[PDB]
Amino acid sequence: SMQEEDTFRELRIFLRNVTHRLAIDKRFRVFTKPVDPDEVPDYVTVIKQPMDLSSVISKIDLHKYLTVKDYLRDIDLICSNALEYNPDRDPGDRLIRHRACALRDTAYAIIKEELDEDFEQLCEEIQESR
Ligand SMILES: OCc1cc(Br)ccn1
Ligand SMILES: [Cl-]
Numbered sequence: 001s002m003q004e005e006d007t008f009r010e011l012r013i014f015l016r017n018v019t020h021r022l023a024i025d026k027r028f029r030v031f032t033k034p035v036d037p038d039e040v041p042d043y044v045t046v047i048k049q050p051m052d053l054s055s056v057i058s059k060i061d062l063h064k065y066l067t068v069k070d071y072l073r074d075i076d077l078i079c080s081n082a083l084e085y086n087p088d089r090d091p092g093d094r095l096i097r098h099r100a101c102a103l104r105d106t107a108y109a110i111i112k113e114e115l116d117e118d119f120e121q122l123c124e125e126i127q128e129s130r
Helices: 002-023 026-031 053-061 068-085 091-114 117-128
Strands: none
Touching: 002 026, 002 053, 002 068, 002 091, 002 117, 026 091, 053 068, 068 091, 068 117
């Protein structure tokens, strides 16, 4: 229905705003763009499902997210990719891991504070009906 299209629209507007707020945080700059093969030619080798905040915007705009749960799976991927690609005790890896945990924690905290649970539940029920 048009009401369901309106619901998904509101979801996309909400997800673009959360994503923008993460992307403008200087801590999260490394997560804003895909990894350039030049700097890191072994990246695409190790990480089978690369994800970054520019790709998340593109996915929102392509109507790939019908629930906040599905969006959070991609935020979780940005985090777990960074924990897997950068697992060493050296400070460069520890700094990326801490920034990746912080992204994930920040996205969850904004959603806890600003997503209405009944809005999510509605999205989940429209998705499950499709
Ligand atoms: O969980 C991430 C995701 C990817 C696609 Br494609 C659609 C929905 N959710
Ligand atoms: Cl830095």
